[PDB]
């Protein structure tokens, strides 16, 4: 199946309190494997996954140099943005960046990304063809014109289409154990009465990986599109994820509703009903 690598960076200015803070994180799919913190003691790139340990000191040197440089370059940028927008230096501002690539079952290149965001909104972005940019405002328009002159795009297509994918295939093979792990979700339901004539049906999915998943409430075959409560998919804290969906059911008609679960770990979508043999039948025992 498809896979992807991503590096996320965050730079925040601290008026009257020193240098801005730079936090860089790297993921392969939903698994974090590295990080960098400018205020950190070591002041060097660090491993956040077991399979990235098996790396020579040359890796940690190169990586530290590249990311430690990205700190400098983004610190410089905040300054520039201040001038462009005529903003006061006594105020805090954020600079977010995100770059990376995608692959298919093949291990072939699919899509690339190089993007920036200032104060929570898009600033400039590399288009899908990896040959032209998308400038949000007139400030970015300048940048876009400069970057075109400096050929920043081709330097970046070189990384994305080339290096980027190589390092991803290396991590997917050198990290088979975890990275190609497909954990099915451990479902079940909970019944919660709301009033004297209505009740709530919770549908749960736990310990699943990857994080992509789909819970669907259905009544007699039709989807409870806009009558269904749903939460964000949250990390369990150990690499797996959790999620739940709910509906108010006119008490008495619980069996009419069904919960459907789709996930990469299941050889087939599930169907759960509020009864024994579907997510709640361990109460006929001791």
């Amino acid at each position: 199946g498809s896979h992807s690598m991503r590096y996320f960076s965050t730079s925040v200015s601290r008026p009257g309190r020193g240098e801005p803070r730079f936090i860089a994180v790297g993921y392969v799919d939903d698994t974090q494997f590295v990080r960098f913190d400018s205020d950190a003691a070591s002041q060097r790139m660090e491993p956040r996954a077991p399979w990235i340990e098996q790396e020579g000191p040359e890796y940690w040197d190169e990586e530290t140099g590249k990311v430690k440089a990205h700190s400098q370059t983004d610190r410089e940028n905040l300054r520039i943005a201040l001038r462009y927008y005529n903003q006061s230096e006594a105020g805090s501002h954020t600079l977010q960046m995100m770059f990376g690539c995608d692959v298919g079952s093949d291990g072939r290149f699919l899509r690339g990304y190089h993007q920036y965001a200032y104060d929570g909104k898009d600033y400039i972005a590399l288009k899908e063809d990896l040959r032209s940019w998308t400038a949000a405002d007139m400030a970015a328009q300048i940048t876009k014109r400069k970057w075109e002159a400096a050929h920043v795009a081709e330097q970046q297509r070189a990384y994305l289409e080339g290096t980027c994918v190589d390092g991803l295939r290396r991590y997917l093979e050198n990290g088979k154990e975890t990275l190609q792990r497909t954990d099915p979700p451990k479902t079940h339901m909970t019944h919660h009465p709301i009033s004297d004539h209505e009740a709530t049906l919770r549908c749960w999915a736990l310990g699943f990986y990857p994080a992509e998943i789909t819970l669907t409430w259905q009544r007699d075959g039709e989807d409870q599109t806009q009558d269904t409560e749903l939460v964000e998919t949250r990390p369990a804290g150990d690499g797996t994820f959790q999620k739940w969906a709910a509906v108010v059911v006119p008490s008495g008609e619980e069996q009419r509703y069904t919960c459907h679960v789709q996930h990469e770990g299941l050889p087939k979508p599930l169907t759960l009903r509020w009864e024994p043999g579907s997510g709640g039948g361990l109460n006929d025992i001791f």
Binding site: Y7, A24, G26, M45, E63, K66, V67, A69, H70, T73, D74, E76, N77, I80, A81, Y84, M97, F99, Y116, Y123, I124, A139, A140, I142, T143, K146, W147, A150, V152, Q155, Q156, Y159, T163, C164, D166, G167
Partner: peptide, 9 residues
């Protein structure tokens, strides 16, 4: 493998 981010706005 991290990239080479060295462009100014």
């Amino acid at each position: 493998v991290y990239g080479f981010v060295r462009a100014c706005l």
